[PDB]
Amino acid sequence: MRECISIHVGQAGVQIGNACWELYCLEHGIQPDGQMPSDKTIGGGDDSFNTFFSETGAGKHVPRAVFVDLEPTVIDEVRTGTYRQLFHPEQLITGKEDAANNYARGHYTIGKEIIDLVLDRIRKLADQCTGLQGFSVFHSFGGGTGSGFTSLLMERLSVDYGKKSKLEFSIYPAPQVSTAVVEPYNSILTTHTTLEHSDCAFMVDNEAIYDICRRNLDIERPTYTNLNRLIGQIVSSITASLRFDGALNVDLTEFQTNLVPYPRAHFPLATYAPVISAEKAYHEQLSVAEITNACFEPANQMVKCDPRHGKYMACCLLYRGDVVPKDVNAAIATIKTKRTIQFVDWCPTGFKVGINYEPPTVVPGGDLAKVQRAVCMLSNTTAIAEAWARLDHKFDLMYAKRAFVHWYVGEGMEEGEFSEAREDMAALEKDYEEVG
Amino acid sequence: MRECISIHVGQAGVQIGNACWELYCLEHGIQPDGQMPSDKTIGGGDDSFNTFFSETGAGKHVPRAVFVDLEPTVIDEVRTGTYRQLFHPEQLITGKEDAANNYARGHYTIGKEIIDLVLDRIRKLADQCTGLQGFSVFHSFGGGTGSGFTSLLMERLSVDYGKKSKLEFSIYPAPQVSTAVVEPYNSILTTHTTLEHSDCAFMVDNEAIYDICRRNLDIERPTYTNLNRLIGQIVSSITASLRFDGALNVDLTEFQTNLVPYPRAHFPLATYAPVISAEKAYHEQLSVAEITNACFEPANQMVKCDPRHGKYMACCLLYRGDVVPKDVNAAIATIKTKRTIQFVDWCPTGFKVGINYEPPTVVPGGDLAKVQRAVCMLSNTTAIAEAWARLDHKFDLMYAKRAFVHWYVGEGMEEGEFSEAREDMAALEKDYEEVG
Amino acid sequence: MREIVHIQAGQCGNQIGAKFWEVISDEHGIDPTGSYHGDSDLQLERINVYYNEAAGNKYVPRAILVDLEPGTMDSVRSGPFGQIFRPDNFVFGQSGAGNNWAKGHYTEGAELVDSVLDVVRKESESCDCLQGFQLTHSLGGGTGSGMGTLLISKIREEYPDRIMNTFSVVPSPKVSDTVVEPYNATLSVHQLVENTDETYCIDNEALYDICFRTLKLTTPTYGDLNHLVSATMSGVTTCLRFPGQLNADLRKLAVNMVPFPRLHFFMPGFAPLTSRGSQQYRALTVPELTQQMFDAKNMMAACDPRHGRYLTVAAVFRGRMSMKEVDEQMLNVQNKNSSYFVEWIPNNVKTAVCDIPPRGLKMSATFIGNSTAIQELFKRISEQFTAMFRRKAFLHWYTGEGMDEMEFTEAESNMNDLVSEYQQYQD
Amino acid sequence: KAEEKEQSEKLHRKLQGLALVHPLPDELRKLIAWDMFLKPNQVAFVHVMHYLFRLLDPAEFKRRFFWPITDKKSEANFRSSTVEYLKHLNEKHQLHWANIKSYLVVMPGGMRFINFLLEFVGFVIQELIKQREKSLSAKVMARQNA
């Protein structure tokens, strides 16, 4: 088997994780107690879901997950919620004191007290794997636990598991939903320290998700529950090739090999279609050609940038549900003739296409309609550097006056680490420009 | 396929459109929910109605229509009425503020805020067409949205779709049903700006329809619902060659080629027979010879003029229902010997004859009787210039004193545009005189 | 766990502190006997922050009541919630401070301070993970001002790594007991600058003008002023007392709100403004709450925020509302008024929402602003101080307790240095 | 009408004199005329008051007023603040200005307004004289200097 361990770090990672695991249970027919009543195979049926679940000797399917937060509040909601019986109590790790929106407190101070406990719990899950592939880490760039504890964890995972792939699902901070002023600092510091440890990182801009919920779901003011349900569909579409029998991206190493030509340029732009409100569920079903054309509209992207200002290094189209390869090829040919799609000269103008026949599932009473077919486009494009430049500009404005720096130095972080992290981000922006 | 997009602009265009689409659904056996229960062909049956309808993946037939008004009131009646489920919500476009019976407000001010949204919705319907023929635009000359927004739309359609035919169904203003004093100005301004963009425009004089409803239907005071039901039968008889298998006017380009010898003289006179009250439905059925002879009576024309004071450049007879070609030829021979029918010397004294065997349908509980046979005569005649001279005379009387001009100048229109539009109308009157 | 130790010092501190405990006990469903009678598990989930569990499922405030005279503390013990407090935590003198900071700091309070620290230690030793301390006091009096700052300095000596927060009532000539209030206030502000991480500036001028001009009370009492303070204190502490998206502690708040170690003086605000016993039948909308919380008329420091810039802002919304509408309105205020926020601190406005509204409201908003406009409050105290100090007026009350005139000159200069530091970051 | 003209000219002279010591901003320079308040002139009012307040106490002006005026709201605020500041000055310096009412600020113009402004300008000039006296024929000075 080819097992994957999911790690959910801080409030954002835990809340996204909780929404993703609800959706995985619904897609595999697992009940909130971990029972699977359609599983007539007391033994090895379609063993593909054993990538993310472990069967216990009581017929209970338990997630290969660890949840970590430095405060108890968000994990206590998981311990008391609908899926409280799904997880083992040892997988739900809580500190007493939080990182207070400070990277340095999350990395050096409070993170150092809890890290060895987290690594012991991860090791207990790794020891239950016959062929551990890697890790999927869920966190926020802006929050102190999501930044500082994740960098410390990613370093220690590279030491203990240096041949195992590490995928990230990172929440990029947005002003409209932002809880801290220092979110740019936390984001630059964590991106610098995780850059050499990540094999592939899926950025999710909260501003992009918020605008999709407003425009496509008609929600005047999206909550984190609305955002996390949409994020859960994208994450489910990315992981669907690892959870079900399929032809493309059947392991974590295939993601790096298909999407990441250069080790530093490991940030694929995700785009998901269709996003339709549950009230519009009885409308005309979108064709394969319409949903594929919606992947090249900036209004449906997971990061706010314009791929028309950059180049494509790689492009993967992951279809789910009622999709035939003939109609996909006809859609791609129509898109290549009508759209400005500039690939880089040294990379083949090739789309990798995955089709999983399992239709998209939606959470009952969620904001999303049941659709017959969906597509997730994963594209490595130089236009994602527009998100780095926006973060770097906010960093530079505050750092030029040393605003808030004393909170990080007060936790024992050196002022030089800000300059080093900013220099590495300037090198990353230049790497993207030289490729573009 | 050979698809057509209908565009309904302002109160008059929307209300006529609503009556036409009700009648089309009845003629094709489509229910108000868009279901077609006789359609055993889950696939391509008599594909002729796919010219005006698009099949959705749920077996629902949706009109290839866009409705546009600068106020919500009239389109909200469509959203709440019997056919509320027929249309897609994206096809029903509403502003907040109207054009207040001013061409300049409809063209320059409020029209400019909504035009790009309307063109995006038209493009989404055009992208669903395999072989878009053209557009059929329904509007009023007298009303501010029907004049000013239609001219702006027709210009932009000529830019985006410059090889696609554009047909107009234009309501000519009548004093007895007229809501504004400035209707002559709005009519001259819109006719000037649409003249180079239209391929063929069917004028409908509200005074002619009102008098037909009074004389033939015994309705003492016709409402817009009575007028629009009669207009819907004429429009249905004109479009019947595009909606059903038939030998004559099978495309939009054949209308121009058969009716429009000169690009500026593109206003065919429509005449419809028989118009009979539903109370007289059990009377003796009119012969082919009687209904053809009724097409040469000014009392049954759609524009108040006398074709005996002018010449015919073209004449088309479109029959529906129980009609044999032998009886049509015998009727035409009797008419040529008994009637003053002067054709122009350079054009053949030829009638084009279309016969569609599908009988005329009438709206249940409407004012019109079910008839076994009907005829629509489309004739390009110089006597239609009598309608221009009546409009020009009313324009000149008000414009000589600059009455109401300040309302148009207050919206940023130049006073010179009135003189330019009036000069182009004087050139059109002269073109009709030189041919006559 | 994440515990806080509360201290209330002198007459004003004990009166406001008693009202704070009454308000939060009711929000947590705790009766005057310490018994729970609530209907939601969310009322108990973080109760240990402010309460100790006692035998028989009783909740006892982690509160220490300090005065140099018994009169206010006997009034608290006879009050509606007077029996909920641990009896051992009533630490009092007999001599009183006589509105003299030197008596509170150097003499009468220096005899009592060790007995207060023994109770502080006994409460702190019972915590699993002490976050820090909160003090309620007035800067105009003797006990709250002088003994309160002595206690802060001694707590910082014994617990140097723990957060120290204060709810500091600033004196005003409109609501004045004695002419020496500017002396007591200047001497205490100097001690707060060095020894606190967070100081909520509660101006009696602003409270009086809110009660009089906004609430239409023709003769505001200290009971009407303390109603506003207790509502604001409930608002500010909401993210510590209830679960939410921000699992807040005192250190995360300080790290987000304090860019410079000396510039920790906050302007608190509350919306909607209500008077005691007046039922608002109309719930405000989110736009009306967001507009009111940024209005100078809802601020409890008598400064105009338009005369300065915001370094940092925290906004706490309470009640069932669209979180999307909250973000849209908060961004609308920032984008329209961006000149009043410093540009060199990116994303310096943080927003939290809690589903549990305060009693008698469906929705409320609490505002916390670190603004350079707070310098107006210190300038106003400085002018009143210098007006008397230039004549050595009333100094014999302090020099009789052993104070030097040089201690006054140092406190005046340190307060002028704080005003200059706020002006530097304004420009 | 004759008296109104005379007072307006006197006002103009005083403003011209002030401009010799303290130059007028460009916006105000174009507005300055002997008859600028014979009719209600809101635009001149705003700039003249702005000029005089800055001469009197720039710091206090910065504290009380927002400048430049960009919208209707800001303009209304400027008027209100003007009335408030004038009242404050009246009290502080005991100038005994009667009827500092909203009308001075709503339709600035006419005899009543011109008289008021003359008094105000007089006050400003007096304050400046005091400052100059502390710090310390035109034809003879000119010749001697040459």
Numbering used by the authors:
A (entry chain E), B (entry chain G): 1 to 436
C (entry chain B): 1 to 427
D (entry chain J): 10 to 145, 155 to 164
Authors' text:
Branching microtubule nucleation is a key mechanism for mitotic and meiotic spindle assembly and requires the hetero-octameric augmin complex. Augmin recruits the major microtubule nucleator, the γ-tubulin ring complex, to pre-existing microtubules to direct the formation of new microtubules in a defined orientation. Here, we identify the minimal conserved microtubule-binding unit of augmin across species and demonstrate that stable microtubule anchoring is predominantly mediated via the calponin homology (CH) domain in Dgt6/HAUS6. Using cryo-electron microscopy and molecular dynamics simulations in combination with AlphaFold structure predictions, we show that the D. melanogaster Dgt6/HAUS6 CH domain binds microtubules at the inter-protofilament groove between two adjacent β-tubulin subunits and thereby orients augmin on microtubules.
To improve the cryo-EM sample quality, we next aimed at boosting the overall N-clamp decoration of MTs by enhancing the N-clamp binding affinity, which is relatively low (~0.4 µM) compared to similar MT-binding complexes successfully analyzed by cryo-EM, such as Ndc80-related constructs. To preserve the native binding mode, we aimed at increasing binding affinity by GST-mediated dimerization of the augmin N-clamp. We placed a GST tag after the C-terminal EGFP tag on Msd5HAUS7, separated by a flexible linker, generating a GST-tagged D. melanogaster augmin N-clamp version (GST-N-clamp). Tubulin co-sedimentation assays showed that GST-mediated dimerization decreased the apparent Kd approximately tenfold to ~40 nM. After assigning the α/β-tubulin register, we observed decorating density at the same position as for wild-type N-clamp, confirming the MT binding site of augmin. Compared to our cryo-EM reconstruction of the wild-type augmin N-clamp, the local estimated resolution for the GST-N-clamp was substantially improved and the more distal coiled-coil regions of the GST-N-clamp were better visible at low threshold level. Subsequent recentering of particles on the asymmetric unit, combined with additional rounds of focused 3D classification and 3D refinement, further improved the cryo-EM reconstruction to secondary structure level for the entire CH6 domain and MT-proximal segments of Msd5HAUS7 and Dgt4HAUS8. This enabled highly confident rigid body docking of the augmin N-clamp model predicted by AF2 and revealed the binding site and orientation of the augmin N-clamp on MTs. In this configuration, the conserved basic patch in the augmin CH6 domain is positioned to directly bind to the MT surface, indicating that it centrally contributes to orienting augmin on the MT lattice. Notably, MT-proximal α-helices of Msd5HAUS7 and Dgt4HAUS8 were slightly differently oriented between the cryo-EM reconstruction and the AF2 prediction, which may reflect local inaccuracies of the model predicted by AF2 or suggest small conformational rearrangements of the augmin N-clamp upon MT binding.
